[PDB]
């Protein structure tokens, strides 16, 4: 019987909303209302990169914070130099169709993947000295949207067949799936201690996912489209989400709900990029109105723009020494800010 | 010290870059939808994951992709689609059942906010069916209006009127709303797809070139 | 949260009348254009009509139009449909959809086999 089910279904989500209600004695906006403003930020363009044909979708910093990769849809991958706007690799892919990349903690390898289906990790200290294909992970169904290095031998990966799993480079098999989500998973990130992580879906759902057991630990909803962009804050026990709703939200691990909620009634466009800063006082948001904004984390009021880009901002991230910010766009066009 | 290097490395890719840029603008591309009873198979099939084929016509390199490996959701990997030159659109015009269905989907497609510039070229699959059931199930039953329609084929002039009917209703929602559709009424045996894709092609990018210099 | 809840199906005689009533919760109503869809017993789904924010376009599919129409609420953030005349043939299970981003006149992927704002809808016989 499905009736049964289903009401023991919504039985325990009135236990659970109940539960939630109940944890709710006050608000975080309320007690970091006594803080002063940070005032206004305001940051300018020091290096622009030129050299994509077409528009682009994803990008990485590296760990030395001086390297980035950027992938283009005509079915390039390029390594920069950041300091002196030399570029040292160029990469041509199998398909023109692109929509992730990685790169590893050590430097070593670089991943690709995209409506292919197959994710493609290519090697960057050969003996010659050229960039060589080295393996190919196959296995999924639909589009890959995500991936993710652990390790030098290990890979996490998010697809279109609502599923995650986690590879074996040297062996190039699942050694572990996570499954659960009823559309597709938007986006991932590892947690700093590489130890859990969260995952975001078109269902307007959130998971935190354990590594090593393969088990969804908790689950957040409070959203109202699909989700975009996901990132956690770096301590460690919070997140922010971004989704087509045209909202931010900041949820947090331990107690199981949402903190705040990011908004203004300017916006009527979706977020398609979310990032932190190194003290997680700022949090940096790129919409569809070829724009960017800042807002304080603990006062939810904007403290600056970036109008620099002239069509959609597809891709955002921070280096990890908080020092710079790149953004991408479907204009060809990466540029720093700091 | 490695800045020599650096330079030399960065005027070794530039110059490779350059070289690949002419070959990317030199052809064209193109996005292949249709359902799964169409015969867009035997369409992209006709001129030789995703399903990529190459055909040329007059020195010219068209470049068609067909996309079938993924679910049945699609508002998310159409979004990379936004850059090509046309969206082929196969429609069977035999099944009065499922064309309510593509109708929907052309309007979705039509108003969808990052393809509002990108042109649709309409393929009006099964003709040699639609004559021989519409001699002989009414139309008359899935479409009311159809009472009140009058012809704006050669064998019998019944056929004209529902052949017109169905395309007139892709014709509305087109003008109801840049961009725009170029319908064709073609069967499985014919072999005059090439050069009309290739007509199309030429209109679209002439358009375009008008508009670049101010002419429009 | 999104839920929806879909009531008022039921027997009903050739010929009669019957009015289905979606409620809707955890989102704004103003903001989203509104579909409902119907599923015959070994079929597919079937896409029956649909209405705007506001309600100043409306539109049908072929078999029902001028014996149904449809109404929204949004005071009481509540969806109507009314049949009259019910032929044999239109025994199935109704499910009430929803628009899946707001302020968008275009509607994707409301009749796939997995959507996830969707009812789980009512029975209908003949």
């Known amino acids: 019987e499905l009736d049964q089910l289903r009401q023991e279904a919504e039985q325990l989500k009135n236990q659970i909303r109940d539960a939630r209600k109940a944890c709710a004695d006050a608000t975080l906006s309320q007690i970091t209302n006594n803080i002063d403003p940070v005032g206004r930020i305001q940051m300018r363009t020091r290096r622009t990169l030129r050299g994509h044909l077409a528009k682009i979708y994803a990008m990485h910093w590296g760990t030395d914070s001086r390297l980035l990769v950027s992938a283009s849809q005509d079915g390039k991958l390029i390594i920069w130099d950041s300091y002196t706007t030399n570029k040292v690799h160029a990469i041509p892919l199998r398909s023109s169709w692109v929509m992730t990349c990685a790169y590893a903690p050590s430097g070593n390898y670089v991943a690709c993947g995209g409506l292919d289906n197959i994710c493609s990790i290519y090697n960057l200290k050969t003996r010659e000295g050229n960039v060589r294909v080295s393996r190919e992970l196959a296995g999924h169904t639909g589009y890959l949207s995500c991936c993710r290095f652990l390790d030098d031998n290990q890979i996490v990966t998010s697809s279109g067949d609502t599923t995650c799993a986690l590879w074996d480079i040297e062996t190039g098999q699942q050694t572990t799936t996570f499954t659960g989500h009823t559309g597709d998973v938007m986006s991932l990130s590892l947690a700093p201690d590489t130890r859990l992580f969260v995952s975001g879906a078109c269902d307007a759902s959130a998971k935190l996912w354990d590594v090593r057991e393969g088990m969804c630990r908790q689950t957040f909803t409070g959203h109202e489209s699909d989700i975009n962009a996901i990132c956690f804050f770096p301590n460690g026990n919070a997140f922010a989400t971004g989704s087509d709703d045209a909202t931010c939200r900041l949820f947090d691990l331990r107690a199981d709900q949402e903190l705040m909620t990011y908004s203004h009634d300017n916006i009527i466009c979706g977020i398609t990029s979310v990032s932190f800063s190194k003290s997680g006082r700022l949090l940096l948001a790129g919409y569809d109105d070829f724009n960017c904004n800042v807002w304080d984390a603990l006062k939810a009021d904007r403290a600056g723009v970036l109008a620099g880009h002239d069509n959609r901002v597809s891709c955002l991230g921070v280096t990890d020494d908080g020092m710079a910010v790149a953004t991408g766009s479907w204009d060809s066009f990466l540029k720093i800010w700091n | 010290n490695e800045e020599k290097a650096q330079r030399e490395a960065n005027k070794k890719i530039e110059k490779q870059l350059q070289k690949d840029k002419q070959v990317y603008r030199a052809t064209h591309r193109l996005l292949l939808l249709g359902a799964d009873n169409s015969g867009k198979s035997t369409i992209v099939k006709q001129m030789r994951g995703i399903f990529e084929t190459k055909f040329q016509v007059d020195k010219v390199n068209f470049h068609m992709f067909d996309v079938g490996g993924q679910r049945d959701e699609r508002r998310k990997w159409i979004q990379c689609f936004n850059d090509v030159t046309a969206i082929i659109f196969v429609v069977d015009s035999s099944d009065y059942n499922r064309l309510q269905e593509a109708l929907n989907l052309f309007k979705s497609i039509w108003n969808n906010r990052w393809l509002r510039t990108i042109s649709v070229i309409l393929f009006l699959n099964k003709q040699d069916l639609l004559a021989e059931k519409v001699l002989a199930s009414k139309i008359e039953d899935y479409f009311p209006e159809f009472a009140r329609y009058t012809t704006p084929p050669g064998e019998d002039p019944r056929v004209t009127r529902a052949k017109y009917f169905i395309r007139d209703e892709f014709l509305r929602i087109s003008t109801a709303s840049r961009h725009y559709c170029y319908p064709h009424f073609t069967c499985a045996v014919d072999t005059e797809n090439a050069r009309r894709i290739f007509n199309d092609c030429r209109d679209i990018i002439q358009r375009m070139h008008l508009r670049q210099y101010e002419l429009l | 949260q999104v839920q929806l809840q879909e009531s008022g199906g039921g027997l009903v005689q050739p010929g009669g009348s019957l009015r289905l009533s979606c409620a809707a919760s955890?989102?704004?109503?103003?903001?989203?254009?509104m579909n409902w869809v119907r599923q015959a017993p070994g079929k597919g789904l079937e896409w029956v009509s649909d209405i705007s924010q506001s309600g100043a376009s409306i539109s049908y599919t072929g078999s029902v139009k001028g014996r149904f129409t449809i109404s929204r609420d949004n005071a009481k953030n509540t969806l109507y449909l009314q049949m009259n005349s019910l032929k044999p043939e239109d025994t199935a299970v109704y499910y009430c959809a929803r628009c899946p981003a707001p302020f968008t006149r275009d509607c994707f992927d409301v009749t796939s086999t997995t959507y996830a704002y969707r009812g789980q809808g009512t029975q209908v016989t003949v």
């Open positions: 955890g989102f704004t109503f103003s903001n989203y254009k």
